[PDB]
Amino acid sequence: PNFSGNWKIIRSENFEELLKVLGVNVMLRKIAVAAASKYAVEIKQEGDTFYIKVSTTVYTTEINFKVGEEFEEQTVDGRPCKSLVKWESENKMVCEQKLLKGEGPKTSWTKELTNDGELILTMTADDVVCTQVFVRE
Ligand SMILES: *C/C=C(C)/C=C/C=C(C)/C=C/C1=C(C)CCCC1(C)C
Known part of the structure; x- marks a missing residue:
């Protein structure tokens, strides 16, 4: 896997929902949609260690995790949570x-690197799945 890169969004579905x-x-x-x-995701991956920077026009946040190790971040609506990636x-x-x-609703996310070279993020709350697609800058 090479998730590392500077990714720019090309499609966002079901985000309002x-x-x-x-x-x-x-x-x-x-306003959030x-x-x-036009938001951007920067990833630096070394083995199972990930650094992720998510940014919009006026806000930026960093996520740091290692696969299999609990870390703290925020839900999409901004509530603190304990997260675990596998x-x-x-x-x-x-x-x-x-x-x-x-x-609150049960939330999760997924991150996929496709064979075509796209990054696909999904974010889920209960029954609703948002899918966002990015390409490399
Ligand atoms: C691996 C990439 C991940 C986990 C990306 C997570 C991105 C978000 C939680 C972004 C959320 C946003 C909002 C909460 C409002 C503004 C629009 C977004 C999509 C930047």
């Missing part, structure tokens, strides 16, 4: 998230 399940009100969802339309195959990993406080 995801945010709706997570309780985000409609005006904010629309607009922010997603491989599903050579070039796809899945992350299960657990809220640090309170209750």
Whole structure:
């Protein structure tokens, strides 16, 4: 696997629906969808160690993890969670998230490097799956 790269989004599906399940009100969802339309993901991967920087026009966040080792991050709607990533195959990993406080929809994400060279992210809340596709810059 070489997930390392600078990735730029080309498609985002079901993102508003995801945010709706997570309780985000409609005006904010629309503004969030607009922010997603041009967002970028930078990945540095060394073996099972990942550094990820996710950025939009005005916000940037860093995710650092090793596969199989619990880490802390935030859900899509911004709630702190404990996360654990495992491989599903050579070039796809899945992350299960657990809220640090309170209750809510069951959330997760996946990251896949396709044979065609695209990066596919999925983000899930209960029954709703958002799929986003990126290409290398
Ligand atoms: C491996 C890549 C991952 C786990 C990417 C995660 C990206 C997000 C959680 C981005 C979420 C966004 C919002 C919460 C609002 C603005 C639009 C996004 C897509 C940048």
